């Protein structure tokens, strides 16, 4: 026999059995925290099920189950079988059209997805699609009205059919996913965001869409309209429209009150009783404003070539407020608020790094200067942020932000405590001498921050996907890591091998 | 200060670049599919795919390429990280230890220079003997393969040309020589070149080819029976072997771009052909024995083969067994027939890979009210499209509903 | 006589001379259709709109396209606006004569005609520090990276050019009484270049001797502003329009006169010379191109090197900008600012453009050269 | 002109100097074309001014696809 190694499970006696669930003999944990021993991704690292507690399992003979079986708790009888063992289970609802967005409604039970469909334009009739998409194989279909944009002479006559593109808001089902219904826009009308929020003291719950014109052999464009749409008993409805002269980039829902973000310049709203808006105020110190983050009251920008921008908003002012700005031009790809303190920023040249409101604030110039703390090579380009955990909430680190990128990458962002950053970031340059890796790079020179014109050294982030690699290091090896090290169970104590390894995984149950 | 801490959930499934050969053992065909970071090494059986091991590196892996030196019966791997850290490797297994091992390294940028404007492009000399790379708009920077480079040396032979399209080498013809599509200021062509190691200088080239189509695209060097080289352009598809040329402009090759490339037959007598719809092509080749040992091109065919997903690897296997790898979304593992179907494609859908693809939006949602969410993707691209809904754990849902709570047990009886 | 072979294929060429952008080795025609050469329908290339690129680089990389970053340029240095105008209330109307930034972006280093270089907080706008440089007046005036050192030079002080210190202490740490106009060296800046007339001499930062003085009597065109500068790999310099290999102290290759006015630039791109409105290479020694928008204006260049500023030294000076791309020299804006540029610098952080402007007409009595600060891509 | 430029051989034409490197590649291509399209039009030439009792012997040299 080998040694011995202490795993959490519950406060209750457990059952560990295995049988044959369709094939290839599967293993399961019946505990209170039940999870299949048996594979993830063909490693020995333990997934959850959709289950609170098991206790027994029942190799049953059902006739709507074929080799299923059935499982015992303190609770209901569970006839069930066990698909493809992975820690991820990815299941694909095709649309055959390019998705845009995506945002949920609480109340009814729908999606929204903004979509994209090319289409070529025919001589007699107007055009014509390439493929039966998800668009037109709807439910429902609509179109839009109210031809607000016919004074300009800008859509002039194409030769050929090259390739126009259509757009669409897709609604589809919660459960059965099915596309319950789409409206078609104006032609040449890009819809560029989308949130679903309340507005005011109207205890409806909308869709609101922002959109654009575009045309080709055109520099930006200054035409485009915000509509507010709701889907009152499964019939989508156009409320409201407002005509804005510019590209409605991104919006947020801020306090009651619609952001908006039209070509360099924020535009708060406010739904009047009469199913309007009313301007409240605007900002203008921007290159492109393309990105919107809100919480609470501040307002986060992300420029097109600036920075990270912080905006105020001071309501007994009625206005906004510049608090501070970053300088430094760094290209913005995403931007999101960590904890209002330190906002994280993501960039063309595959870089994160975090920028921090300042504190000593002995004048007003070194207050209106954000200053950058911590960066980080992230070699990928982070389309997306989010909040919320992929786990179950038990009720470490603080908070938790998932991101989205071009090469299906996701991955954690959270934040530390201050004894824990250097407790691991020792680690990690010990963990730099002993793992070679393939290729013979130094991690250093990796993850540093590297633009076109900036080298400077990865400093504030810990990359955790070297620290979770301490898992499959041997003994021999991992003594090695445990140096004449620091532990902090305010008090002091040597590192040992057993603890050390406590510490990782208490990260990895994150993910 | 800020302190945080950044893991990977979900590990790059996207693909970049795709090489077969044998890179594990001597007599075992392999597919080295590396995606953003990561670099899978599959083996190609009877029934699919089989992994051996998946390796990561630190960098984008832009460029890689397996070769075979002369002196070694297996074959080594040359990868070209983003922050232009190049690398020689190779497999070494002994029982359960399975280990790669760096054969030559070293960091290759120049201090000065643009970039680029078609990214990144490297070939291996078909005669193993120099290692070529477009790097910094203005510059072939060549590596000179052999056991003296402990360290990678590197050459920095001066293209007088500036914006160079596409390259490769050409094939045997005793000196190792080299194609180019370069852009003009008025017009553009296709020059050549013969590299000189010892004297680190460009030799004279042998192909003129002043005025080639107006977006040529790429080059297909063509193999040592009939050596030459095939533009793939818009509209138009040529060829080239210093005297002779042939040239169709097929009306199945008009509605897209041709992106990807692969030699299916040893000796050049076949080449597949994807694009930006979908659609795989077939470059055929009449091979003409014109003489008692004269074997000159006669004829160029284009097939049209059916639709897959859209394609940036295309990799010929072994028995009428393709992989097309997708960075757009899911990539697929195909079978090419010899008759056809009811719609006239050969292309026989197997089993496929699910591609998280480009997420473009996302929400963190729960439809269970539990302590555990779920992470709908706004996944894929033009006809790829598709949410992707992301879980933890194990989905048993389909579940019946018994109301015996406590129970001990129950076992069958059966007659 | 002909045959019809013959008639055929010149009835064929005859059209085929249609085409625009033909081929060589074209394909077999059909004499039942037309024949048009295939024509470029560009599909790699990023869409002219910034939305449709916008849509785009969400699902490909970085800039959307091929020539993506160009268009993201045109956009983007074709817009400017006025944020603070910095004038000179001592005596009631300003006279400023040259205009550069410090090294930490904080203070932006004005010059005065009197010989004194003024100190003002680019946020507050107010004079901090100012020194006794100079006699004369101000001519060039440009820091040190690292933030420790600071050349100027004046215009007739019998000290034509000092380095002065910039850490803490503020003294003539070496001095010239020759050089109209000193320049450091690029990358590793302990070299300081000068320029008397049509001799350049190479100093040392250390000891401030004379490293190597280069000028060859064959040689020289004796243009009217020669200023010898270096390569950003500190290997060449243009003295008169000829190059320098500072390996062995040899000349290179004289280029052709054409403008008498201006001896040359690099290029940051270490391949090209760009000599006033003539592109030259480094290694071919051929003329790439020529740009007739280049007429006599100095040139500054961003520090990515990816655009190429213009102000006209025609007599008025400088009626307008000129925005040049660094890549294919295709011009961006000429904005028009309706007074007379005198001199431009620029950020290092790419935001704004120091601006020395002259107030009232053409008057060479009354003189109110004011600094008016731009910041980049904005309306 | 003639020397800085492709060498035209004394020929009046097209002096423009983008005009110029138009015609030099223009002459130098090389037309080809089948025999099919020239004898389809030789057919359909000789069928239609009325002498066509060598169209029906010119099916014995070639296919002929249209009556």
């Given at each position: ?89 990815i299941r694909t609802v095709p649309l055959?059209?390019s998705p845009?967005?995506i ?301 989205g990128?071009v090469?299906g ?103 | ?12 499934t996207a ?313 757009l979304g899911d ?23 699910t591609n998280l693809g480009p997420i473009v939006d996302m ?12 992470l709908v993707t706004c996944s894929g691209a033009?006809?790829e499209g598709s949410l992707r809904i992301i ?25 | ?58 699902s ?320 | ?67």
């Open positions: 026999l080998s040694d011995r190694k202490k795993v959490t499970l519950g406060t209750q006696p457990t059952v560990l059995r295995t049988f044959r669930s369709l094939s290839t003999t599967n293993v399961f944990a019946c505990s209170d925290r039940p999870t299949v021993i048996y594979s993830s991704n063909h490693k020995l690292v333990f997934s959850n099920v959709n289950l609170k507690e098991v206790n027994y399992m029942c190799p049953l003979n059902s006739d709507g189950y074929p080799d299923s079986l059935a499982l015992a708790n303190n609770s209901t009888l569970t006839i069930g079988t066990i698909d493809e063992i992975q820690k991820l289970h055959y059209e845009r967005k945002c949920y409604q609480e109340v009814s039970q729908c999606f929204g997805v903004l979509s994209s469909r090319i289409e070529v334009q025919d001589t007699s009739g107007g055009t014509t699609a390439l493929r039966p998409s998800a668009s037109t194989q709807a439910l429902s279909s609509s179109v839009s009205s109210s031809k607000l944009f016919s004074s300009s002479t800008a859509p002039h006559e194409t030769s050929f059919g090259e390739e126009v593109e259509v757009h669409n808001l897709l609604i589809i089902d919660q459960h059965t996913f099915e596309v319950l219904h789409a409206h078609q826009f104006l032609q040449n009308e890009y819809a560029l965001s989308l949130v679903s929020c309340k507005l005011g003291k109207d205890p409806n719950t909308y869709f609101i869409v922002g959109t654009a014109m575009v045309y080709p052999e055109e520099a930006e464009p200054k035409q485009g309209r915000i509509v507010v749409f709701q889907y009152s008993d499964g019939k989508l409805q156009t409320v409201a429209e407002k005509e804005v002269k510019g590209a409605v980039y991104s919006m947020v829902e801020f306090n009651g009150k619609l952001l908006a973000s039209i070509n360099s310049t924020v535009r708060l709203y406010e739904w009047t009783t009469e199913k309007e808006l009313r301007t409240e105020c605007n900002h203008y110190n921007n290159i492109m404003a393309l990105y919107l983050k809100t919480k609470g009251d501040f307002i986060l920008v992300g420029d097109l070539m600036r920075s990270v921008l912080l905006l105020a908003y001071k309501p007994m002012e009625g206005n906004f407020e510049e608090i501070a700005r970053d300088f430094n031009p760094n290209w913005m790809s995403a931007v999101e608020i960590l904890d209002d303190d330190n906002f994280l920023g993501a960039e063309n040249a595959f870089n994160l790094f975090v920028c921090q409101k300042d504190s000593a604030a002995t004048t007003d110039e070194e207050r209106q200067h954000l200053q950058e703390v911590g960066l980080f090579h992230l070699g990928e380009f982070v389309n997306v942020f989010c909040h919320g955990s992929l786990v179950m909430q038990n009720l470490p680190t603080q908070g938790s932000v998932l991101f990128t090469n990458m996701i991955g954690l962002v959270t934040s530390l405590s201050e004894s824990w950053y250097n407790l691991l970031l020792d680690m990690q340059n010990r963990l730099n001498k002993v793992i070679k890796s393939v290729g013979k790079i130094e991690h250093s020179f990796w993850r540093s921050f590297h633009t076109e014109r900036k080298t400077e050294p990865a400093t504030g982030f810990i990359d955790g996907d070297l620290i979770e690699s301490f898992l499959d290091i041997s003994r021999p090896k991992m003594q090695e890591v445990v140096a004449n090290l620091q532990y902090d169970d305010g008090m002091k104590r040597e590192a040992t091998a057993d603890d050390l390894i406590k510490v990782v995984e208490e990260l990895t149950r994150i993910h | 200060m800020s302190y945080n801490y950044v893991v990977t959930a979900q590990k790059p693909v970049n670049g795709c090489v077969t050969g044998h890179f594990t053992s001597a007599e075992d065909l392999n597919l080295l599919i590396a995606k953003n970071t990561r670099l899978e090494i599959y083996v190609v059986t009877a029934e699919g795919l089989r992994p051996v091991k998946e390796v990561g590196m630190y960098g984008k892996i832009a460029v890689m390429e397996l070769f075979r030196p002369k002196g070694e019966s297996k074959d080594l791997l040359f990868i070209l990280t983003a922050k232009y850290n190049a690398c020689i490797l190779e497999y070494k297994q002994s029982g359960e230890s399975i280990d790669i091992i760096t054969r030559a390294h070293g960091n290759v940028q120049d201090r000065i220079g643009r970039p680029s404007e078609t990214g990144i492009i490297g070939i291996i000399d078909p005669e193993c003997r120099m290692i070529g790379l477009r790097l910094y708009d203005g510059l072939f920077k060549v590596i000179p393969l052999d056991r003296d480079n402990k360290e990678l040396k590197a050459f920095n032979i001066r293209l007088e040309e500036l914006h160079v399209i596409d390259v490769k080498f050409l094939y045997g013809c005793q000196a190792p020589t080299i194609c180019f599509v370069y852009q003009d200021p008025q017009g553009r062509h296709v020059k050549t070149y013969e590299v000189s190691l010892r004297e680190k200088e460009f030799n004279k080239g042998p192909w003129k080819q002043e005025n080639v189509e107006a977006e040529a695209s790429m080059v297909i060097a063509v193999p040592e029976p009939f050596g030459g080289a095939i533009i793939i352009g818009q509209e138009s598809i040529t060829y080239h072997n210093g005297d002779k040329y042939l040239a169709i402009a097929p009306p199945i090759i008009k509605q897209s771009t041709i992106v990807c490339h692969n030699r299916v037959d040893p000796n050049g007598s076949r080449y597949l052909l994807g694009d930006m719809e979908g659609r795989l092509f077939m470059l055929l080749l009449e091979k003409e024995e014109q003489m008692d040992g004269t074997v000159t091109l006669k004829d160029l065919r284009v097939e049209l083969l059916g639709e897959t997903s859209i394609a940036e690897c295309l990799t010929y296997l072994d028995n009428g067994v393709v992989f097309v790898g997708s960075r990539s697929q593992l195909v079978k090419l027939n010899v008759d056809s179907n009811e719609q006239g494609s050969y292309v026989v859908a197997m089993e496929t890979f929400c963190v949602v729960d439809l269970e009210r539990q302590g555990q969410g779920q033009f006809k879980r933890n754990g194990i989905g048993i849902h389909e579940h019946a509903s018994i109301d015996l709570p406590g129970i001990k047990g129950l076992w069958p009886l059966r007659s | 006589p002909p045959t019809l072979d013959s008639i055929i294929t010149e009835y064929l060429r005859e059209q085929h001379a249609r085409c625009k952008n033909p081929v060589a080795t074209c394909p077999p025609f059909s004499l039942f259709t037309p024949h048009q050469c295939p024509e470029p329908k560009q599909r790699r290339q990023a869409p002219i709109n910034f939305t449709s690129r916008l849509n785009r680089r969400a490909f990389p970085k800039y959307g396209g091929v020539d993506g970053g160009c268009f993201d340029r045109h956009l983007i240095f074709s817009r400017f606006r006025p944020i603070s105008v910095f004038r000179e209330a001592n005596e009631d109307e300003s006279g400023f004569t040259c205009c550069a930034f410090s090294a930490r972006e904080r203070f932006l280093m004005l010059g005065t005609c009197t010989g004194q270089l003024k100190l003002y907080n680019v946020f507050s706008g107010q004079e901090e520090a100012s020194y006794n440089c100079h006699n004369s007046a101000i001519t060039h005036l440009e820091p040190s990276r690292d933030g420790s050192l600071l050349l100027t030079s004046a215009t007739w002080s019998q000290p034509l050019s000092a380095l002065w210190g910039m850490k803490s202490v503020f003294d003539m740490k070496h001095s010239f009484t020759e050089d109209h106009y000193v320049e450091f060296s690029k990358h590793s800046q302990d070299r300081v270049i000068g320029t008397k007339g049509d001799i350049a001499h190479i100093y040392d930062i250390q000891t401030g001797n004379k490293l190597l003085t280069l000028f060859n009597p064959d040689l020289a065109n004796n243009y009217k502003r020669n200023c010898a500068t270096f390569n950003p790999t500190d290997d060449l310099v243009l003295n008169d329009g000829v190059l320098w290999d500072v390996r062995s102290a040899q000349a290179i290759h004289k280029f052709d006169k054409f403008n008498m006015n201006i001896s040359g630039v690099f290029h940051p791109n270490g391949l090209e010379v760009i000599i006033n409105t003539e592109i030259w290479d480094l290694r071919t020694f051929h003329l790439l191109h020529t740009v007739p928008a280049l007429d006599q204006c100095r040139v500054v260049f961003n520090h990515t090197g990816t655009v190429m500023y213009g102000a006209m030294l025609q007599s008025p000076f400088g009626s307008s900008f000129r925005t040049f791309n660094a890549t294919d020299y295709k011009p961006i804006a000429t904005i028009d600012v309706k007074r007379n540029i005198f001199d431009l610098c620029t950020d290092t952080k790419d935001c704004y453009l120091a601006v020395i402007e002259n107030q009232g007409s053409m008057d060479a009595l009354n003189m109110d050269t004011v600094c008016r600060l731009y910041e980049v891509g904005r309306q | 002109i003639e020397r800085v430029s492709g060498k035209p051989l004394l020929i009046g034409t097209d002096v423009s100097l983008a005009r110029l490197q138009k015609a030099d590649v223009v002459a130098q291509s090389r037309i080809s074309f089948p025999e099919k399209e020239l004898l389809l039009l030789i057919r359909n030439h000789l069928i239609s001014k009325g002498l066509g009792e060598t169209a029906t012997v010119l099916t014995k040299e070639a296919d002929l696809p249209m009556t």
